[PDB]
Write a protein that binds this ligand. Structure first.
Ligand SMILES: Cc1cn([C@H]2C[C@H](O)[C@@H](COP(=O)(O)OP(=O)(O)OP(=O)(O)O)O2)c(=O)[nH]c1=O
Ligand SMILES: [Mg+2]
Ligand SMILES: [Mg+2]
Length: 380
DNA sequence: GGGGTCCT
DNA sequence: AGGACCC
């Protein structure tokens, strides 16, 4: 019934770097964060470089790999919002997923375009891009026609993104978010594909690991592996009763639906972010004097970002990670502090954060943090 | 890794 | 405050 598109930018961070320094769009490029190559351009993947590879592995496997540092997300974040703002011009309800993916519900727009078409030009309606599984099109099938118009809009989207932002990316068009997202990566990079309904099963069964289904992550997949469940079909087939009584009703019914390619979740308007955070990770921080300096650094950046935003946060959170998950402490931001932008908001915010710090770190007893993070949320 | 979302 | 998910 619905016509949903999923847009997915090509090697996002690397693409941004290649644009900032066009002297790089010729070379294999990797974006580095500490010891990780979080992503690389397609010249690099040709040479054996994979996403999230160790710089050691990447170096050895590709000594001519140019590395740029991508620990500061400022520019990626800015381009990211330019992308969704551009998509919002097509339809106001755009849902972000991470920095480089967006869903848009095109069905109202598709409907509008059809109501305007004439008889002799419905003939006549064509696909833009790939048709998944080379499935043949039936122009008399109104579902095929709607999905085809979807593909046309999707191509207008990719064209605008290139023309206005210089950004290249993939699109997937299908009847729900799950399927749009699975199909958008079938032809990469910088291409698009549309999923006709009779090819839905082929798409879901094309997956080789149950983790490949968006919504099934490390923990959930590990549990399923424990239950003898490894293929999509194993999950499709497993006893709903037993599944429920091992993962709970909510998860069980949702992921089991997902395994059939069913996903009724609406595309949601993401809008402005609901939180701003900054982190730094390190081998060791073992003194409060360090912690405070670290935190002042993080807080400085955040205050810059809150500044531009316009809205004001009403709670602060401090996150740590002890040597060998994470722990957090939050509290509301005093009413008087919330009026800042010209004054000196630093010293009182660091005072609050340090109270939070000592609340979860015994400073009289040696400690070994390996991450510090500050988060502003409850924006108003 | 350096972010972000929602649910319990 | 933690846990799970997504990138
Ligand atoms: C998965 C993941 C992505 N990212 C960032 C790096 C990526 O540039 C960006 C989007 O990730 P992806 O969309 O998963 O991959 P990509 O856009 O870099 O490359 P492609 O889609 O062509 O395969 O998010 C992280 O920082 N940490 C992570 O764990
Ligand atoms: Mg991408
Ligand atoms: Mg998954």
């Amino acid at each position: 019934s619905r016509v949903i598109v999923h847009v997915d930018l090509d090697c996002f961070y690397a693409q941004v770097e290649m644009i900032s320094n066009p002297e790089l769009k010729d070379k294999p490029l990797g974006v580095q964060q500490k010891y990780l190559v979080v992503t690389c351009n397609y010249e690099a993947r040709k040479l054996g470089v994979k996403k999230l590879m160790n710089v050691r592995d990447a170096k050895e496997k590709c000594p001519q790999l140019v590395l740029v540092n991508g620990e500061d997300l400022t520019r990626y974040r800015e381009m990211s919002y330019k992308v969704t703002e551009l998509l919002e011009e097509f339809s106001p309800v755009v849902e972000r997923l991470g920095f480089d993916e967006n869903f848009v519900d095109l069905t109202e727009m598709v409907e509008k375009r059809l109501q305007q078409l004439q008889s002799d030009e419905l003939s006549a309606v064509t696909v833009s891009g790939h048709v998944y599984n080379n499935q043949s099109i039936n122009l008399l099938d109104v579902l095929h026609i709607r999905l085809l118009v979807g593909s046309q809009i999707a191509a207008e989207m990719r064209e605008a993104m290139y023309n206005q932002l210089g950004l290249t990316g993939c699109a997937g068009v299908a009847s729900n978010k799950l399927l749009a997202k699975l199909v958008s990566g079938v032809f990469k990079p910088n291409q698009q594909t549309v999923l006709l309904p009779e090819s839905c099963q082929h798409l879901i069964h094309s997956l080789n690991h149950i983790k490949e289904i968006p919504g099934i992550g490390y923990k959930t997949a590990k549990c399923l592996e424990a239950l003898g469940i490894n293929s999509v079909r194993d999950l499709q087939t497993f006893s709903p009763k037993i599944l429920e009584k091992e993962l709970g009703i909510s998860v069980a019914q949702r992921i089991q639906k997902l395994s059939f390619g069913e996903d009724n979740s609406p595309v949601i308007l993401s809008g402005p972010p609901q939180s701003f955070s900054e982190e730094d990770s390190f081998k060791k921080c073992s003194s409060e004097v360090e912690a405070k300096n670290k935190i002042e650094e993080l807080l400085a950046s955040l205050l810059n970002r809150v500044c531009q935003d316009g809205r004001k946060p009403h709670t602060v959170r401090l996150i740590i990670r002890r040597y060998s998950g994470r722990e957090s402490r939050q509290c509301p931001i005093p009413s008087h502090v919330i009026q800042k932008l010209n004054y000196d908001v630093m010293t009182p915010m660091v005072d609050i954060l340090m109270k939070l710090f000592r609340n979860m770190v015994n400073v009289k007893m040696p400690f070994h943090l390996t991450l510090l993070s500050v988060c502003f949320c409850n924006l108003k």
